[PDB]
Amino acid sequence: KTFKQRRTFEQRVEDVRLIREQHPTKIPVIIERYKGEKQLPVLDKTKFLVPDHVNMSELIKIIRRRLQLNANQAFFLLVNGHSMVSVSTPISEVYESEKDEDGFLYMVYASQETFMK
Amino acid sequence: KTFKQRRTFEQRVEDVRLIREQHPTKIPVIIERYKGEKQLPVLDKTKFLVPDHVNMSELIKIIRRRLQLNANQAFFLLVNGHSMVSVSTPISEVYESEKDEDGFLYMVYASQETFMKLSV
Ramachandran angles phi, psi of B63, nearest 5°:
-75, -40
Contact B83 A85 (CB under 8 A): no
Amino acid identity of residue A99, one-letter, is K
Structural domain spans, chain A: 1-117
What's the rounded Cα separation, in Å, for the pair B20 and B53?
Answer: 15
Tell me which fold the domain A1-117 belongs to. Answer: Ubiquitin-like (UB roll) (3.10.20)
Q: Name residue A58's beta-bridge partners.
A: none
Nearest-CB residue to B119 (from A57, A82, A112) = A112
Amino acid identity of residue B80, one-letter, is N
Contact A83 B83 (CB under 8 A): yes
For A107, the enclosing helix (H) or strand (E) is strand A105-111
> Which chain B residue is nearest to residue A64, measuring alpha carbons?
B120
What's the rounded Cα separation, in Å, for the pair A98 and A84?
Answer: 12
Ramachandran angles phi, psi of B12, nearest 5°:
-80, -40
Calculate how close chain A gets to B109, using CA atoms only, in Å.
15
Provide CATH code, domain B1-120. Answer: 3.10.20.90
Rg for chain B, CA atoms, rounded: 14
Contact A84 B116 (CB under 8 A): no
Task: Give residues with Cβ within 8 angstroms of A78, minimum separation 6.
Answer: A34, A84, A107, A108, A109, A110, B84
Contact predicate B64/B75, CB 8 Å: yes
Name the experiment that determined this structure: X-ray
Positive or negative: CA dihedral B3, B63, A80, A108: negative
What's the rounded Cα separation, in Å, for the pair B19 and B16?
Answer: 5
Contact predicate A49/A26, CB 8 Å: yes
CA distances to A95, B24, B44, B52 from B20, in Å: 34, 5, 23, 12
| 3-state SS assignment for residue A35 | coil
